[PDB]
Amino acid sequence: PKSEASERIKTGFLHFKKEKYDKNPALYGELAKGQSPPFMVFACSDSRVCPSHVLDFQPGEAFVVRNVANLVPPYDQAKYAGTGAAIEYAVLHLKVSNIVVIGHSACGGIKGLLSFPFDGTYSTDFIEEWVKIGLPAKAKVKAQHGDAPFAELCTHCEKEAVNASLGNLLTYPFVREGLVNKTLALKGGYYDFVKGSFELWGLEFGLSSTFSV
Amino acid sequence: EASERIKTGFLHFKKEKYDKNPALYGELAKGQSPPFMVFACSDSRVCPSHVLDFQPGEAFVVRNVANLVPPYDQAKYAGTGAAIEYAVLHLKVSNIVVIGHSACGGIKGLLSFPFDGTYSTDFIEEWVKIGLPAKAKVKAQHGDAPFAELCTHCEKEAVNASLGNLLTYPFVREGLVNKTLALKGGYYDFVKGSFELWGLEFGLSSTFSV
Amino acid sequence: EASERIKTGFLHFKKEKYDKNPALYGELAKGQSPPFMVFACSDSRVCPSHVLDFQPGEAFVVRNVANLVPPYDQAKYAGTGAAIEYAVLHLKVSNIVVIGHSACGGIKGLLSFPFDGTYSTDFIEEWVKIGLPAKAKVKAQHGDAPFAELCTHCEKEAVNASLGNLLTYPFVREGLVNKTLALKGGYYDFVKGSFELWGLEFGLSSTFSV
Amino acid sequence: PKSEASERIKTGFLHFKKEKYDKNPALYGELAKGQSPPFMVFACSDSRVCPSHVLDFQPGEAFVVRNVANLVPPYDQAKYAGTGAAIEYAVLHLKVSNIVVIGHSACGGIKGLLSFPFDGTYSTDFIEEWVKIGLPAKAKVKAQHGDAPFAELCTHCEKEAVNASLGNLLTYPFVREGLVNKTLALKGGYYDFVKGSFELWGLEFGLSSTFSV
Amino acid sequence: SDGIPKSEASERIKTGFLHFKKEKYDKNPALYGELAKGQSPPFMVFACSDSRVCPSHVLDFQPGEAFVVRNVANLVPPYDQAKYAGTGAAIEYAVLHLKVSNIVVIGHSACGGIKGLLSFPFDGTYSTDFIEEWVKIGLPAKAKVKAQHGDAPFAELCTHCEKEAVNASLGNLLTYPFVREGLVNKTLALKGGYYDFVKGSFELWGLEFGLSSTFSV
Amino acid sequence: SEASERIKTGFLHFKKEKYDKNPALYGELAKGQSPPFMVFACSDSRVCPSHVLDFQPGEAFVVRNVANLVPPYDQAKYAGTGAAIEYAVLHLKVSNIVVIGHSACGGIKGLLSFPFDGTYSTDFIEEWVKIGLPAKAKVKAQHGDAPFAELCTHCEKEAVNASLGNLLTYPFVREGLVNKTLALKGGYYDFVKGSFELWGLEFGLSSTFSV
Amino acid sequence: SDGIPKSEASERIKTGFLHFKKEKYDKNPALYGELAKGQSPPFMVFACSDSRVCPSHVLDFQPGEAFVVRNVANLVPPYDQAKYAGTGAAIEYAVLHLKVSNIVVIGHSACGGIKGLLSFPFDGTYSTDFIEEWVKIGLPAKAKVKAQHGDAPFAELCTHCEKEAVNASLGNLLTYPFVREGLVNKTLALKGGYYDFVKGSFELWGLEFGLSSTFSV
Amino acid sequence: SEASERIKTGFLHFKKEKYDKNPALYGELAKGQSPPFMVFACSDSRVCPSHVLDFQPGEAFVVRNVANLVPPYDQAKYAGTGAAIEYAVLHLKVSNIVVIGHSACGGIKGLLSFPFDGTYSTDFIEEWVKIGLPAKAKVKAQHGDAPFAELCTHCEKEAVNASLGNLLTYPFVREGLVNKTLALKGGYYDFVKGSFELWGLEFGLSSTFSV
Ligand SMILES: [Cl-]
Ligand SMILES: [Cl-]
Ligand SMILES: [Cl-]
Ligand SMILES: [Cl-]
Ligand SMILES: [Cl-]
Ligand SMILES: [Cl-]
Ligand SMILES: [Cl-]
Ligand SMILES: [Cl-]
Ligand SMILES: [Cu+2]
Ligand SMILES: [Cu+2]
Ligand SMILES: [Cu+2]
Ligand SMILES: [Cu+2]
Ligand SMILES: [Zn+2]
Ligand SMILES: [Zn+2]
Ligand SMILES: [Zn+2]
Numbered sequence A, D: 001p002k003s004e005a006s007e008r009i010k011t012g013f014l015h016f017k018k019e020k021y022d023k024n025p026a027l028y029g030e031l032a033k034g035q036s037p038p039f040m041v042f043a044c045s046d047s048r049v050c051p052s053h054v055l056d057f058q059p060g061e062a063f064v065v066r067n068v069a070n071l072v073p074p075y076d077q078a079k080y081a082g083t084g085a086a087i088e089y090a091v092l093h094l095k096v097s098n099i100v101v102i103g104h105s106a107c108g109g110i111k112g113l114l115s116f117p118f119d120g121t122y123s124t125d126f127i128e129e130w131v132k133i134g135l136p137a138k139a140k141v142k143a144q145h146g147d148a149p150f151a152e153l154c155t156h157c158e159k160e161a162v163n164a165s166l167g168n169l170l171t172y173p174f175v176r177e178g179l180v181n182k183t184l185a186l187k188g189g190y191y192d193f194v195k196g197s198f199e200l201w202g203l204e205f206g207l208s209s210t211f212s213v
Numbered sequence B, C: 001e002a003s004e005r006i007k008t009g010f011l012h013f014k015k016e017k018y019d020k021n022p023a024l025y026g027e028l029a030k031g032q033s034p035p036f037m038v039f040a041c042s043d044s045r046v047c048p049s050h051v052l053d054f055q056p057g058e059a060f061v062v063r064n065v066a067n068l069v070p071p072y073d074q075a076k077y078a079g080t081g082a083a084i085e086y087a088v089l090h091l092k093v094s095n096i097v098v099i100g101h102s103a104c105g106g107i108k109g110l111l112s113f114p115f116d117g118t119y120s121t122d123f124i125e126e127w128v129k130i131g132l133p134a135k136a137k138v139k140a141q142h143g144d145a146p147f148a149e150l151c152t153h154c155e156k157e158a159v160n161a162s163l164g165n166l167l168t169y170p171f172v173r174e175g176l177v178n179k180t181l182a183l184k185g186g187y188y189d190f191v192k193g194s195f196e197l198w199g200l201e202f203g204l205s206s207t208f209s210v
Numbered sequence E, G: 001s002d003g004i005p006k007s008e009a010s011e012r013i014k015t016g017f018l019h020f021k022k023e024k025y026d027k028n029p030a031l032y033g034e035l036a037k038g039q040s041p042p043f044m045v046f047a048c049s050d051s052r053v054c055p056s057h058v059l060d061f062q063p064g065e066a067f068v069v070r071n072v073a074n075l076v077p078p079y080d081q082a083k084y085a086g087t088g089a090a091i092e093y094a095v096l097h098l099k100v101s102n103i104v105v106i107g108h109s110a111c112g113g114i115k116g117l118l119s120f121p122f123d124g125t126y127s128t129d130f131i132e133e134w135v136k137i138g139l140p141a142k143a144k145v146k147a148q149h150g151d152a153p154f155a156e157l158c159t160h161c162e163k164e165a166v167n168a169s170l171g172n173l174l175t176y177p178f179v180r181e182g183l184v185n186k187t188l189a190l191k192g193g194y195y196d197f198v199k200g201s202f203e204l205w206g207l208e209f210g211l212s213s214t215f216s217v
Numbered sequence F, H: 001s002e003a004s005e006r007i008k009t010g011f012l013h014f015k016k017e018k019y020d021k022n023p024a025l026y027g028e029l030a031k032g033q034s035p036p037f038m039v040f041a042c043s044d045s046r047v048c049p050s051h052v053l054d055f056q057p058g059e060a061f062v063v064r065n066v067a068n069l070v071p072p073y074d075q076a077k078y079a080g081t082g083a084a085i086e087y088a089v090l091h092l093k094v095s096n097i098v099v100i101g102h103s104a105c106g107g108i109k110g111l112l113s114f115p116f117d118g119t120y121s122t123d124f125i126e127e128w129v130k131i132g133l134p135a136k137a138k139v140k141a142q143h144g145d146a147p148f149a150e151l152c153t154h155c156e157k158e159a160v161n162a163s164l165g166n167l168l169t170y171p172f173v174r175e176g177l178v179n180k181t182l183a184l185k186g187g188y189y190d191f192v193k194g195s196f197e198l199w200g201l202e203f204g205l206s207s208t209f210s211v
């Protein structure tokens, strides 16, 4: 009498071990020495949006962070050491050259962001505390498309929130410095597993000659 | 350039998976009910979906530096607490597995940093300080053990600390007591290509009321 | 005045106890080996030695506001951690009982204070914030319950939170796993003159290593 | 098959309930309404020194704090909220009129204070961290009685440390204010359960006319 | 002056004001009647205190057009309420109260401040009360120039540093949250300029900033 | 870009109308500057000192900031201002420092309306204009009951007197005054009425006795 | 002066110094030769700036005896590195560097500062630039006196407050850790004094501080 | 108590030798004070101004502090100093403010030896004497190579000039100087050589033109 879950784990790793790990001694021979991913990714915890899947990332390719609604809070050593550490490690230690915040269709996190009043009353332990990061995004979307159906509405808010997060990335000095030296780039993505579509946008950043006389 | 890597890669998944399983994703798109919640490190070399061959819809994944789970704190650790509260009380997962791994950069730091009042990072030390109880233990039970050994002990014991922290969340304890939730610790050694798993038992029983 | 209260009182104990048990204290004076470690509130109305009729040498007692046990933190909670580490690893106690009690001033505060960023005390709120997970739970499961009820739920659930915090100490977990240590929560209701006790089960078991 | 410990607890409370609680309905009838102890006591956790015993304190008499080596750390909201809260509650909420720090013979805490090097190397998780509060006391005693036998030595250090703690009480504004308004008094005690003796000293504090011309 | 002394400076000031009054103020009653009520400059300019580079003249700015900050080496330090409040107050007032739409930082040829930045060792010893303390804001630009053009002749170093310093200031404008919100909201644009009065030229550049989709496959 | 264009246009106009038509002048200015004036003036877009006093290139070393304020000597907090005074006074060796205030100054308006009671509602503005608190205190003590508009005019002028006082906290400023190589003046430009007032400051030190 | 003007103030200063030089300095070569090398005053004194209460005269203090602080109402504010650094620097220098053994705070009769403390409302409105701000240090003493002697006549209020203020300052000396360590180590003693120049009297009191056994039964 | 005794003795001596022997004088002083001087002097036990300048009761309103420093006007940080100047100048209406520095001043020695490089090793001393940084900067620039003892003398005198400059940041001080109802002077007492130097400060404002 075994644990279904435990077994499910065992059989999964076994599959990985023989089909992947073993059939690629070259790869894991190096990966065992260190990592050097060019990407750092923020994706939702949501079971349906594994980043390694949707974008077919191979091992050693992307340093990943997954949290409720793929939110990137602003720089704060007392309230957001978790996020700050991942960003600081990825950008300054692994030297990623890209940061991508990926939002997705039907996000329960975003949906709660829209549904919660944020009028000083909380019905959750941490959820509201955490989704508040996207309030700006919610204000914008709600003010702009105030009469848009919730279904549509959420879609707008899922996308805006990525920009908000992107906006928050700029509160980190080492992120800004990365953009200045052009050793870093920031991008936003949107996965709609319903229509099975993907949208990718980015941040234009750099100086440009205007004229000389 | 990298924007292409991103298109091609998504195109691959589009045809090779999203399509080749219309009845699959056609269902996923309708909602989610994963039985697992996984805590794994952000290291690009240990994507849980790769290491445990998870399929979309199976696990709600939280990935952070050194796969740490801080104790209950609404002021300092909302990120974590939010995921736990969501997976447990909303998605209704049945398991929470904290997976540590060999050659963890996060744990390596925890080991080198002195935590004597001086900090040389903006966030890194603040974060991995969560694992200090594990560092304290290992250094007291395996102080004269080779560094490589120390790291493994700390990585595994760090998982244990995180399992203990999971027990500071009322709704995690409640789910354990109702046997609707199970806690597990894992350890992936991508060097020797091995994997360990262990279970945690937590229960409460009334003794008497005079 | 009060200096007298102190002399007379000590004189009483001198003859009425210290002497009337020469073979008793003659032994105590040689060392201590208490089987219990008790966490009870500083309230003058609940001295554990009175409520559970403990005799000198039976229990290593830690008394603080609202009998709270914060999680492992060498920077903010050395007082607690030191007592636990001493009782567990040095005196070798077998049990750790956290005793909450009715009409707890400490818990009452925890309930009234908003913990919304504003503080009106120097230490009081900082301290009882430890019990927030308990406040969160009770307010979500018994929000429309009469205040008196709420307090009792919070007092008992605060004990549970503290039991969970005890599990963030590696050496407490280790002792539990070796079955050399047991965790218990108690609740003294000096109003109706009743007492509850409950036990906590914690264990770890290996599952597999491929 | 019952738990010895559990049973020991049950029988203890039962004894209390019938012999004490019941045979004093007057007392607990009031005590159930609130408390108002005139004392606040700092005693060692040590099983052999229950304050309620040694000084025969009755319920409602003393607000107690027990910790390793009955140490009173100085005012610090980040490192010592535990101590600060007890002192703040006792002094400002219960209005105690006395604070007594009681040291005792053969204190493992003090003994460790003396035995530990405190040279930047720690062999404990919290013990050394916590007993350091008494370093001043240790310096004094050690410098003064450097050649005193450890047995004797410890005794000196157990007593000095109380003064150190007493010294730390003065770092709390509300304690100082209490002494200024004379609504509070500070005392030190030493219990020697070996010879079964008790020493009580206090803090002289107040203004006194010197002369008028 | 028949024995009575005269202050050249006071007289110069009086002559100048009367000239402005006659040739400009009095000849533009519409303009000045409107400016008397408020200002809505579309530009905020940072230029050097140097007496040869008055933005008014060089870019022909008219009264009401440019909210101007002038200091040694036209430097923009990073956000610091304790050390750089004058700079921060100017940007905060311009961006949030006057709602300017452009912030232009202009460096120039033969800048004495940039020359000091390059001439000073910044080796732990100072020989000025404030000059070194201030131009240290440009150390990062000095480093870049020293690395990229380490063998170049001093004068060439200066020109390079004068321009790179402008870039370092633009970088520092990004440490101001209200500036970032402006770029994000597309209500603000940042620009760098360079005035060579030796040759008689002006170079202008800008900061590209903004989201732009790459694909929706 | 409408803005880059405005900038493009402006320079070309300067180039042919001023620059190319004064080769002798720009030829000497290319070699260095020796302006007789250092001028502090508000950043306000309506009070450019070049225009108001018709200063020509090479005549005035200019500092412009919010409310034309001069903080007292402080290498830790007011390096920007100190660095300009030091450069002007010791290196370019200006002979005059003129602090010019003006009608309807927003900085002074803020100074007069902010409470300065512990709470701040700005990130830097209040912090900066606090420099003017002594002028606010004087005005309120002597004209406290006056309508706000008058209080603004009084405060704008006293704030210049406060800055002149702060210049005297720079040792090299005191020394130039003592040596008669430097002069200090305050100015007030009213762009509503279209007027200008100038006043001078006298400062000296004299040995009395040594016994 | 035959037409040449003379400064009374400068002359008063010169006359006074020459007098001190002749009658004191020159007549105490031993004393002054020793003071020229260092000072070791056993007292630190706080007295009012009031021109009528110079501690030198009133307590006949000789040069080298008392490190003195004089300010409005002889007030000792509590420890504050940001608001009260002058007071803190004097106590720190006296206690830790000069190692004085006594700190004496002396109040006095008809103190203008204490009169203002009592006359001012402290109702949210100020009418002074600094006077109210400073004497607010004595608000606690004003409260005590107003409570204990609320019906007394104004003058009586002042005398009470002048003395109580001294006590509030003694209380504030206790907010200084180095002062507390001194009392504890018995290397420092605190005293309050009161000088009535109307009647011609002096009252002195001290702070009792120290551990003292009660029993060893 | 040896100390209370010393204090007891001293007063009685004052009582019969000065107080009782000058009934006319103390009788008027009991009615109020109108000292023509306000004096800032060091707290140092060797430089009591009453002794050094032989000031009699009723002649000088005195402020004594570490290094006889006068910070600039700041109601938030330097209320103690500001309150004394305001009382002396506006209420007692003193006619002179004299700032007196002295040989071998410990405060100046600290000023010259502390680094003021971000780290402090005192709780208040460095904080307070930083007021003198401009004098330290001047001295180092003009006498930087001098032996420490000379640097101390130079800095002690320039520190008085710095305080005189800070007095000019009090509006009511500028106004008394302008109105000729107040005079400012610096002094230096050398108790090693036994000498005294006095110097005066001249300050004024004059209307130049209004057009
Ligand atoms: Cl976070
Ligand atoms: Cl977190
Ligand atoms: Cl604690
Ligand atoms: Cl504590
Ligand atoms: Cl600045
Ligand atoms: Cl500045
Ligand atoms: Cl002060
Ligand atoms: Cl002050
Ligand atoms: Cu993944
Ligand atoms: Cu007890
Ligand atoms: Cu201009
Ligand atoms: Cu004196
Ligand atoms: Zn989602
Ligand atoms: Zn890792
Ligand atoms: Zn309680």
Ligand SMILES: [Zn+2]
Binding pocket: D044, D045, D046, D068, D069, D070, D104, D106, D107, D108, D109, D110
């Ligand atoms: Zn003990």
Ligand SMILES: [Zn+2]
Binding pocket: E048, E049, E050, E072, E073, E074, E108, E110, E111, E112, E113, E114
């Ligand atoms: Zn320049």
Ligand SMILES: [Zn+2]
Binding pocket: F042, F043, F044, F066, F067, F068, F102, F104, F105, F106, F107
């Ligand atoms: Zn203005």
Ligand SMILES: [Zn+2]
Binding pocket: G048, G049, G050, G072, G073, G074, G108, G110, G111, G112, G113, G114
């Ligand atoms: Zn007085």
Ligand SMILES: [Zn+2]
Binding pocket: H042, H043, H044, H066, H067, H068, H102, H104, H105, H106, H107
């Ligand atoms: Zn001195």
